[PDB]
Design a binder for these strands. Sequence first.
RNA 1: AGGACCGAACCGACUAAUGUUGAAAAAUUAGCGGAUGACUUGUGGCUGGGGGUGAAAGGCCAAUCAAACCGGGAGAUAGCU
RNA 2: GCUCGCCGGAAGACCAAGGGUUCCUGUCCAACGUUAAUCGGGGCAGGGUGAGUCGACCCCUAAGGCGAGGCCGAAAGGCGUAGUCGAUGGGAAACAGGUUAAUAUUCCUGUACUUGGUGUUACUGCGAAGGGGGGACGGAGAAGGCUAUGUUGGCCGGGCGACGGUUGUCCCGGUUUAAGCGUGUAGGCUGGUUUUCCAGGCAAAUCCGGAAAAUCAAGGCUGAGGCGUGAUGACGAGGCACUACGGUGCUGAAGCAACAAAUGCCCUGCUUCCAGGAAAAGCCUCUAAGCAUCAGGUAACAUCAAAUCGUACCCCAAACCGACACAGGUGGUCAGGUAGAGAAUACCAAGGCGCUUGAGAGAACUCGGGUGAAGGAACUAGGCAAAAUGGUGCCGUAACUUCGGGAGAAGGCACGCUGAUAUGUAGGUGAGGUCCCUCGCGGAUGGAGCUGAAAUCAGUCGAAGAUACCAGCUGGCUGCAACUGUUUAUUAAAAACACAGCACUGUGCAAACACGAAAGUGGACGUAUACGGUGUGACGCCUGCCCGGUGCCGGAAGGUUAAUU
Lengths: 46, 271, 93
Amino acid sequence: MKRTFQPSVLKRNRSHGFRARMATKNGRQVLARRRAKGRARLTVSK
Amino acid sequence: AVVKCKPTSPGRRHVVKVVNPELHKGKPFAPLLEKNSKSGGRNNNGRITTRHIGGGHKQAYRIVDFKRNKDGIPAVVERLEYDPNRSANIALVLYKDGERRYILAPKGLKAGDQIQSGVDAAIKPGNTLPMRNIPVGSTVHNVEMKPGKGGQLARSAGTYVQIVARDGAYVTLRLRSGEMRKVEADCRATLGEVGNAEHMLRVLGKAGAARWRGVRPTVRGTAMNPVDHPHGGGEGRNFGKHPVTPWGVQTKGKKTRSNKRTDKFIVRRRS
Amino acid sequence: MIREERLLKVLRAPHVSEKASTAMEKSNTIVLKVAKDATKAEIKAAVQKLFEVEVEVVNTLVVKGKVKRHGQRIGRRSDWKKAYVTLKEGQNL
RNA sequence: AGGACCGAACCGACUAAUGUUGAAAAAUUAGCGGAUGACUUGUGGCUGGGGGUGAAAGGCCAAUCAAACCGGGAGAUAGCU
RNA sequence: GCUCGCCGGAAGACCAAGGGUUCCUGUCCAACGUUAAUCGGGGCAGGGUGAGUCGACCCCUAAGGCGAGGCCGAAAGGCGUAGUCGAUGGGAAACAGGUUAAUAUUCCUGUACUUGGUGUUACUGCGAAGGGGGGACGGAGAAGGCUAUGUUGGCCGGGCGACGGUUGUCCCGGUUUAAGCGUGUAGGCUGGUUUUCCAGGCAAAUCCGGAAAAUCAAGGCUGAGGCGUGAUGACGAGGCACUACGGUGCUGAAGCAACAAAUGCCCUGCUUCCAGGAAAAGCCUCUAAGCAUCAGGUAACAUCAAAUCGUACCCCAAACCGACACAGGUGGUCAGGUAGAGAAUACCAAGGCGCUUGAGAGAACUCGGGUGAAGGAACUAGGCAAAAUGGUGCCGUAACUUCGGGAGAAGGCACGCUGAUAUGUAGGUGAGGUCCCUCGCGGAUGGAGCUGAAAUCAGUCGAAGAUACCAGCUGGCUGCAACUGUUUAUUAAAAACACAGCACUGUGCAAACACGAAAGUGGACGUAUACGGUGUGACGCCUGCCCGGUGCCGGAAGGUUAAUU
Ligand SMILES: [Mg+2]
Ligand SMILES: [Mg+2]
Ligand SMILES: [Mg+2]
Ligand SMILES: [Mg+2]
Ligand SMILES: [Mg+2]
Ligand SMILES: [Mg+2]
Ligand SMILES: [Mg+2]
Ligand SMILES: [Mg+2]
Ligand SMILES: [Mg+2]
Ligand SMILES: [Mg+2]
Ligand SMILES: [Mg+2]
Ligand SMILES: [Mg+2]
Ligand SMILES: [Mg+2]
Ligand SMILES: [Mg+2]
Ligand SMILES: [Mg+2]
Ligand SMILES: [Mg+2]
Ligand SMILES: [Mg+2]
Ligand SMILES: [Mg+2]
Ligand SMILES: [Mg+2]
Ligand SMILES: [Mg+2]
Ligand SMILES: [Mg+2]
Ligand SMILES: [Mg+2]
Ligand SMILES: [Mg+2]
Ligand SMILES: [Mg+2]
Ligand SMILES: [Mg+2]
Ligand SMILES: [Mg+2]
Ligand SMILES: [Mg+2]
Ligand SMILES: [Mg+2]
Ligand SMILES: [Mg+2]
Ligand SMILES: [Mg+2]
Ligand SMILES: [Mg+2]
Ligand SMILES: [Mg+2]
Ligand SMILES: [Mg+2]
Ligand SMILES: [Mg+2]
Ligand SMILES: [Mg+2]
Ligand SMILES: [Mg+2]
Ligand SMILES: [Mg+2]
Ligand SMILES: [Mg+2]
Ligand SMILES: [Mg+2]
Ligand SMILES: [Mg+2]
Ligand SMILES: [Mg+2]
Ligand SMILES: [Mg+2]
Ligand SMILES: [Mg+2]
Ligand SMILES: [Mg+2]
Ligand SMILES: [Mg+2]
Ligand SMILES: [Mg+2]
Ligand SMILES: [Mg+2]
Ligand SMILES: [Mg+2]
Ligand SMILES: [Mg+2]
Ligand SMILES: [Mg+2]
Ligand SMILES: [Mg+2]
Ligand SMILES: [Mg+2]
Ligand SMILES: [Mg+2]
Ligand SMILES: [Mg+2]
Ligand SMILES: [Mg+2]
Ligand SMILES: [Mg+2]
Ligand SMILES: [Mg+2]
């Protein structure tokens, strides 16, 4: 049966990529939170 | 020409169509075309603000000249064309200087007819004139609200306005709704009635015909749950309440006009 | 004109394999490991000047590094550029 | 001509059996409905939580819906076990 | 290796997405693989992806996103102009053969094509952020001309048969060739040309639009296919010689015709219908400031450049989405033979597989099937399930009806093979030759050859001729909903929702209404024959009484009455 995850690189990057996060103050706060925690991978971009 | 369809299929049994042989059969005049994409009733917030709109056939917009301010140049009717954007038909007119324009087609108009606009124009159907220079009692259409702004009243198929009185700087108009309204005498109007008066005699016959025109189904308030309509709820068919809009305003008889700015120009309500 | 140090830095190493030897024999084509940023023109000029030969065409491709494992961790070798540079059958490099 | 007829693809899901620590967190087999249309499908886009969307079942909104998910107030309060 | 079995509109082949080395070679079998494992998509090491023409990148825009100033908003921010991004759409160019263990339209061989910088020379009014043309567009349907492709014959090479016959009206195999270039055909559309004038194209125009005279009457654009060349080349059955047993080198015959024929092409065509069917750029053309023997444009020739990134492998799946080597899901293209209406179905071709536990036995019972005496719904909540009907042609077919239907109503007859009509018919296609011409892919003739239904009569075998697969059960009464549709993803598909039609009611446009602290936006580039809300629900016959209560609407005499003062 058709499941919930249907990958698409363009849609993934546009939804959750670095530039999508950087475009809004809430996204920049997401990035700041993840830097403070110390994540090795900030976003889906890499 | 009102033609009913033979009941060869259930969806064709009640279909009544308006077919005009005189209408053009080819493509429209391209330099007067412009795209008009659809909205689905959604505004710039993306929210549905007018229900029951969506789908339908792709349509091009035809730039129709509602101002008719090319004064003193005679023009000839080239052809009458179907317009998907409005009930009324439109006419392609060629001016003596080689300029081409679309106008609303009034009743009795045909290819080759002569039209003119201006103070010096004759009192013939299709001619645009200031209402100051149009006799009292004349039937007109494509009426202006403000001088030089463009026709805004009596534009639908078969519509018209009569000039009931003329006092000073204002004329009195009897609109299709029955309302008597005052407009400045310098506002222009077109002589005659809008054509295609049989437009209201057509019978769609099937639901898909309404879908072709971009109308989505209407769901009755009593058929849903109380959480999303005041009318909703009940074990079986129950109503027991005064009818209202989905937002709680009484929808049977309550007046909603509130415009004190334009109240002074209203001689009498439609009644 | 591409400067001297650019030409001296673009060429890294020659490729060696059965395909490389076959290319050299059959089609007079040497295969090289070139700089990741080296373009076809820079490669052509560098082979013309450092090896003293004549080139008519250069074909390039980027090799992707393999994912390997050393002591249960994860690692990836670097990508590198490979060049098929042909000579005009009169130099014998 | 047709929201026309029979019938594959395709979309669906009326019956029965099987399966029910399944081959499968909704399927298989034999039958079944639509199949030029209010059809079906690819790609991209828009609408955000007392809000959206709904040919309306309180349906659907990432296996979660009479108020999603994540984090915070927070060690809420619990005459109860 | 030889047999056997399975798929073959797929269980074969190829793209896109998604994944990322799973691809090839050597080596290992600890763990992983539902068993073993010498094997593997497992471990380890090495190798492998070659582009001016493919795609991305690039130019252009859609929905939509962002948005200098700006408008608005406690702040954060919202919206939006000029702009700038954004494909799922528009815009230049390459084909055939050979080659690797693994790449190829990328490498090699042969033959082409496109754009741009230049330079020389010949002639010359060039030039935009402007005008104009063009790009540029729906559904359905029908015919003709074709091709891919198939079949048969001819031709060429081979064969003379494990068991009766097989030198023939016999068996097997092959019979292939692209882009480009020349020809401009079936067919589609459009009258051509030159002068004179102009309230139009925000200014100009020699361009587009309009008006008028003159004259010629065929000009222009489009266009599958074929023919010729490309090609005295390539490839090609088979033999010749090696063989490390994988395969390698040389050589290589014939390489034609007729018929049949697409859902593909001509065709973005034609016909018709109403629901009336993107944008912008590339391209062509016109002028403006400006430059004006310079610059720039058109042409011929020569040289130079075409960068960068991707290219391995899976790709309807053991490699993507489902925790699995999971009976699930996943867009597009290719599409052979016999029978068949068919992309159904059966058996096969090319090609790919036998599904990663086996060996015995032949109890109950469970699952999936086959047959069944006599009876035939007696079963059961219920004919659930099963059994049955099933095709084509012809005959024939009731009540009722909105005159379309009901209707495939019901029911019945024929069906194989052989011969003859007719050494192959009705037809389809069509060479030779003959005549003509505004001569070529031409008009008339003409019929060789090929292909070819259906019918009738006669005979004949079987229990049975729509023999397999495939493929309606039928009729009578009645409730509900008019109907096609929609719905509780995952216990409810219905009488529920929707519907066309009807009515009430609001709404005069800066419309009512809705999303919004607002600016704005939708309604709508619509204007009362329109738009919103509510209820009813095709059609036919109709829709009676009550305004006391609640609500709504109208009114303003009188009483009561806020801030204020
Ligand atoms: Mg509505
Ligand atoms: Mg309605
Ligand atoms: Mg309900
Ligand atoms: Mg309520
Ligand atoms: Mg009740
Ligand atoms: Mg009651
Ligand atoms: Mg090359
Ligand atoms: Mg149908
Ligand atoms: Mg049906
Ligand atoms: Mg469903
Ligand atoms: Mg099934
Ligand atoms: Mg059907
Ligand atoms: Mg309920
Ligand atoms: Mg859910
Ligand atoms: Mg709550
Ligand atoms: Mg607290
Ligand atoms: Mg607690
Ligand atoms: Mg074997
Ligand atoms: Mg690996
Ligand atoms: Mg392998
Ligand atoms: Mg072992
Ligand atoms: Mg094992
Ligand atoms: Mg391996
Ligand atoms: Mg490349
Ligand atoms: Mg935009
Ligand atoms: Mg700003
Ligand atoms: Mg904005
Ligand atoms: Mg752009
Ligand atoms: Mg694209
Ligand atoms: Mg390969
Ligand atoms: Mg052919
Ligand atoms: Mg088709
Ligand atoms: Mg490949
Ligand atoms: Mg398996
Ligand atoms: Mg599977
Ligand atoms: Mg599908
Ligand atoms: Mg099949
Ligand atoms: Mg197994
Ligand atoms: Mg048994
Ligand atoms: Mg049994
Ligand atoms: Mg049986
Ligand atoms: Mg038996
Ligand atoms: Mg029996
Ligand atoms: Mg019996
Ligand atoms: Mg019986
Ligand atoms: Mg009984
Ligand atoms: Mg009993
Ligand atoms: Mg049954
Ligand atoms: Mg049965
Ligand atoms: Mg009853
Ligand atoms: Mg129904
Ligand atoms: Mg139905
Ligand atoms: Mg359910
Ligand atoms: Mg169900
Ligand atoms: Mg407004
Ligand atoms: Mg009802
Ligand atoms: Mg009813």
